[model samples]
Target: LPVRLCKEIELFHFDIGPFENMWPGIFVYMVHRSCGTSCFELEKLCRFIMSVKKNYRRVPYHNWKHAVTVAHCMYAILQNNHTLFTDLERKGLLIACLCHDLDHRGFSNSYLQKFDHPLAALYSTSTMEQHHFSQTVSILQLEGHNIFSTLSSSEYEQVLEIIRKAIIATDLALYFGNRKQLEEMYQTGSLNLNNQSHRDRVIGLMMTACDLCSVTKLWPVTKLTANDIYAEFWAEGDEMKKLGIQPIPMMDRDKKDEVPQGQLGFYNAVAIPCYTTLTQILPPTEPLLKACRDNLSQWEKVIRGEE
Candidate 1:
């Protein structure tokens, strides 16, 4: 029996169930539709995406499902907003979103540094992000996975660079720097997407915006995802305790009561500024801002024992 392709893609609020395991097909469809390239190797591209999906580690928050969600957000952003990126940029962003968390070990960079993981030793800064970029290149190098094989050499190189920058930009530690730069541009009206350098900066920030988009989802969706994120966090904390290290408050199960307030602080400090800055440049993304505020209000209620 074959599953019918009757499901319509709901960009803003995608449901998981039937689509959770079907992300490769969805990604291939998105690439073919948005990349503006001949689908001579479409089947191979689908296989490549499936292989990439297979490589995702089984973690509560950073698994294949989360990757697909992030990719879907990027696709939705590209679909609703215009003039912010080229078709090539659109393709690269989607790819980068899908691959950004590849091989995540359910641990943060600080944990890696404290434990002296080889990954932390490899890159002094942006360790996990650098590894993700390397993993993306490794997948592309696989036989029949080079979906960009049809691209001219220069075009291929450009897309690869875009993907690299986009993936690396997901590092949360770098988010404030990007926000400051983009905010400066917005205030002075100096943001020019036409220029390659300015365009790169915008794309980097967009990656961060999409990465933290769980806060921008509807309340129910945000709660579900937050549960999964905390599960992953607490698991890491448990491991840290076994290793005689004290886990951060958000990660420690003993501090579980702090989640609601912690999340409220997170939204106020990170997600709000991210989506607000993005909305300033792309007004069509104001819905993200709205959702973030809505979720924040819900968190406030939870903090107040009203939920």
Candidate 2:
């Protein structure tokens, strides 16, 4: 049976909550809009998408809801910047956002490294990201999946490669490098989206921007997502303590009171600089910068309340 999308689903927005069952239609619509359904079967694609959603764990964060939010951010970006990318690139960007955190265990890479988790050995760098990309490929290879089956062998391989780079780009550590590289291009006033090298780099930054997009939503939406993230962080910290391993300050359950301070630092060090550089190249992303700044002011008020 073919999966039918609700005619009213186009009104879905990220601020309310999880898109839930509507995610399949939203994602398939994105792929159809990007790569077209002439070569693909929509029914099989829908099943593949739902399977990917089910693969996400029921964690406080980094679950299916977070995944949908990231994908929706990418979808929003594409809506504004479709003319900037080739169809293949657009498809890869959306797919990367959807699968970037697949099967996340609510633990950071540092925690896994500290505890000597099996994945740390499997991928010495970008441990969780590498696992996410691997999991994506595994799913596509499963029977009834592989929605890209209609593509030629070369096209299929290229899409997989694009997906790999985009997913790994979600590692926050990589974001800084991409940001600096784009920042230099901005300073020189020669940032060219038409250049393949420049475009790929920008797409890398896009993945980062979409991944942390919750920080740029309205206060109510941002607060709900932030609490969910810290819940997962605190849970990991509790487990670390049980194992006699010290978690990072942001992840420490004892430092729960410091969330506002930590968020302030994060905005200063990561989120603000990220959106600033992104908006420099893609002016349409200015709303993200503005919303993020608004959130920063709110955090400052909380910090001042401590005095």
Best prediction by lDDT: 1
Residues 10-112, model 1: lDDT tens digits? 3555544355656676776666656554643777677678887888998989999888878877877887875656777887888899999998989888888
Each model's backbone clash number: 0, 0
TM-score on alpha carbons, each prediction: 0.94, 0.92
In model 2, what are the clashing residue pairs, if there are any? none
Whole-model lDDT, candidate 2? 0.83
RMSD of each: 2.2, 3.1
Task: Tell me the deviation in Å of residue 53 in model 2.
Answer: 0.9
Could you tell me how far off, in angstroms, the CA of residue 47 lies in candidate 1 after the best superposition? 1.5
What's the residue-level lDDT of 265 in candidate 2? 94
The count of residue-pair clashes in candidate 1 stands at 0
Give the C-alpha lDDT of model 1.
0.84
List ranges where model 2 is wrong by over 4 Å: 1-13, 16-18, 33-39
